[PDB]
Design a protein around this ligand. Structure first.
Ligand SMILES: CCOC(=O)CC(C)=O
Lengths: 471, 474
């Protein structure tokens, strides 16, 4: 069985004499851990929920004692998930499992079973990690590249600096941090979620204190008319959340009109540019804050975790937003994860351009097939000309697309005959498809993230799948 | 299955060859290993399609990348149910965990070749020829780290007292698993004349390893008793042939120790080579070099302790009459199959390998005697308590302890079951871990025995987890 990978939760549950009877989750943030405790306590009071702090307590190595700690949360089996942004990183968990014998346990409400001292606590580990100084050199490579590929083609716009970029453990943690930041500043606090679903943003915004936000599902011009009618009447609005190159329909919102409404009614615009990249699009003039999941195409390798937060120095709220984000900043991006991101980010522009070219060819190849009703891709969707107001010159139309077949039961046979990776993540170096089975947490849509493979390769796997689906 | 995904090299390779469904797969480093699996499936169902696809990163400017980013993919129908022979021959020949994630990161830069003409297995990587985004943190195939491993192994087998030559680092051979070391030495001895003795050694892969190696006349001796040695001597005196004998110093799971002195004396009179595995009874605790021609060691176990690296060891005794025969063969046919990242971890954790052995021998001794004096316990298998005790006290260095492994035989089997399930420690088949672990007879001699690998925790800690389990078993 051994060498074993994973097992930090099994090892931690053994250390607290609870291998059974409870479920467990591991966080780096006690803030995020406490939120899970509240979620269970507000669904069932008197439920035993304990929050155990593991720490490597007595070391003179600053790297180890600042990173070899985690928070274990126990709750009843009776038993959020869209909050998969605050859990322990994969490489962070394997780091803390290797050092668990050197770590001690604390719990505030003292159940004496949760106060354990490690078998080797105080002793020196057999080796040091390969990264040094919290991986802050690799974190600055990440911040510089993120800042350099969002620089706008407008030469009269202030550039983005590395210190205007904030790194977090996931893209959802980045969205959570900016949502909690806008709530804490004074004034009213009603948020607008515009053209953004099939993500964790709505639950995260609700849990960050916006008790219920104005949802605009589609991201249409009519939707914007309803928003403007409400603002002109005297309605309040402090922050708007939207995503550039929306999923899974590849819609593009009117960032110009959104920015114009923000300019007269004084709210903050948060745009996520994970799907439509900053390599392909120039959205800096229209966003006050840009969120990006580094786990996706930024990394490509699908072996590292990260999230980014870009505060626009051209924003009327730059100063207020940056002061809060830096005021409450905590380095929660595990260094090993930062090492991989800083290496794979070097060819992030090149890889984006490559899979946008192939995605355009595959989208138009699929569009011309009789079994397909229509294909959702920026070159083919009604927002086509909207996508072009922001498209950088010489650049393409993204790596994501979705297929709507004519008959739903053809979509199912096609998806099963399609010999490529299947799963929920996007921005991978290998192409991946998702059905409506997942993404449900048209009802026969098939989403496709296009990777780095040749156009002949992807064309072959799609054709063969269409053949086996066709009677 | 959200990204980052751990593992998935086998799923990614199956997609590359257009066979994500309908087939089973195994990934090896050696072509010989792959060919052995193919034969085993072909002789149980000849009409089964078995293909062997070699993945390789062919041309890199770093020699590290192109020599280690290569693996062998073996596909066979799902109809095949794996037997014990293939199970163990796969547990010793499979790709290491860190080696699998290394080649998954580089799979886009690798191409596929197949000897048999199936065009679906002749693929070019999407990024083939391009430069990888980064280099591994280890350099020069980790041969500096590998020299620490060979140096440490050589220093703690240096036979005490007597009058023998010391073991140098170049007498140590590193392999990917403990069984790969046993497999390599078994095939080496075939060239000489084909009778192998496996002595006090089961619950291991040595029988499949030796049988598949070519020994056409095997002799199994389950316990390692003196009475089984009498059967061997009667057979040798009668004129029987025997070329190699396999034994483990402290047996699994009864902690028995064979008469290595008598075994070595028989080897000196009938001219066969003795291979001793010292994984359980360590080289820190025991001095067995005078009685073995070859010593094998699983580095995955207490040598590493952290249960996060894979390695196997082969030490050729320079005081052996066959030293120059066996050493020449092992290097005549040597291939570096220890992934450098695995060697880096082993080279770090081995530095306190003697210290950790002493720590978990002390705790295991205290807990063994605690269990022995409990009314619910019939007897405990530990070198201080077994009839084989006095056999260990000859090979045992003084100031050193009695090992980290023990097994418990309760008086009532249904007490053993309730005890094992109430026992709040790690459960699994591996031993030599830094945290203590238990195994029932489900996995793996009474059929209610409970085996225990003792880790680095206090006696107060281990006694507490044991006592509480005993309470709930009453
Ligand atoms: C966390 C965002 O997840 C996605 O990338 C889109 C999805 C849920 O399928």
């Amino acid at each position: 069985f051994c060498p074993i990978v994973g097992g930090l939760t099994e090892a931690a549950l053994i250390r607290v004499k609870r291998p059974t009877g409870v479920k467990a989750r591991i966080f780096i943030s006690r803030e995020a851990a406490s939120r899970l405790e509240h979620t269970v306590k507000v669904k069932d009071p008197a439920a035993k929920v304990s929050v155990v702090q593991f720490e490597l307590r007595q070391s003179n190595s600053p790297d180890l004692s600042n990173w070899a700690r985690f928070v274990l949360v126990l709750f009843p089996e009776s038993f959020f998930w869209l909050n998969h942004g605050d859990g322990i990183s994969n490489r962070h968990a394997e780091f803390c499992n290797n050092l668990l014998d050197f770590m001690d346990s604390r719990c505030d409400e003292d159940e004496p079973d949760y106060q354990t001292c490690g078998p080797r606590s105080g002793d020196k580990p057999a080796g040091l990690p390969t990264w040094t100084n919290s991986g802050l050199e690799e974190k600055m490579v990440i911040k510089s590249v993120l800042a350099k590929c969002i620089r706008s083609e407008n030469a009269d716009m202030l550039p983005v600096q590395s210190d205007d970029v904030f790194l977090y453990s996931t893209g959802m943690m980045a969205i959570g941090k900016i949502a909690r930041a806008m709530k804490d500043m004074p004034g009213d606090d009603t948020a607008v979620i515009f053209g953004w679903l099939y993500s964790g943003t709505l639950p995260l915004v609700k849990d960050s204190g916006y008790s219920k936000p104005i949802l605009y599902g589609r991201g249409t011009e009519e939707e914007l008319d309803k928003l403007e009618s409400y603002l002109a009447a005297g309605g309040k609005c402090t922050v708007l959340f939207t995503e550039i190159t929306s999923n899974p329909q590849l819609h593009s919102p009117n960032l110009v009109r959104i920015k114009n409404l923000a300019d007269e009614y004084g709210f903050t615009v948060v745009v996520d540019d994970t799907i439509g990249t900053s390599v392909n699009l120039d959205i800096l003039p229209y966003a006050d804050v840009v969120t990006t999941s580094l786990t996706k195409i930024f990394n490509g390798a699908c072996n590292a975790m990260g999230g980014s937060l870009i505060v626009n120095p051209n924003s009327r709220h730059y100063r207020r937003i940056h002061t809060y984000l830096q005021g409450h900043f905590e380095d929660l991006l595990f260094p090993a994860d930062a090492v991989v991101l800083s290496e794979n980010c070097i060819d992030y522009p090149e890889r984006v351009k490559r899979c946008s070219a192939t995605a355009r060819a595959i989208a138009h190849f699929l569009a011309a097939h009789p079994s397909i009703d229509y294909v959702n891709y920026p070159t083919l969707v009604p927002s086509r000309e909207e996508y072009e107001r922001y498209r950088r010159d010489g650049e393409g139309y993204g790596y994501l697309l979705s297929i709507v077949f004519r008959e739903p039961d053809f979509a199912v046979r096609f998806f099963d005959a399609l010999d490529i990776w299947k799963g929920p993540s996007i921005g991978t170096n290998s192409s991946i498809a998702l059905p409506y089975s997942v993404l449900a947490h048209p009802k026969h849509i098939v989403r496709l993230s296009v990777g780095l493979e040749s156009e002949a390769w992807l064309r072959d796997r799609v054709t063969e799948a269409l053949a086996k689906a066709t009677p």
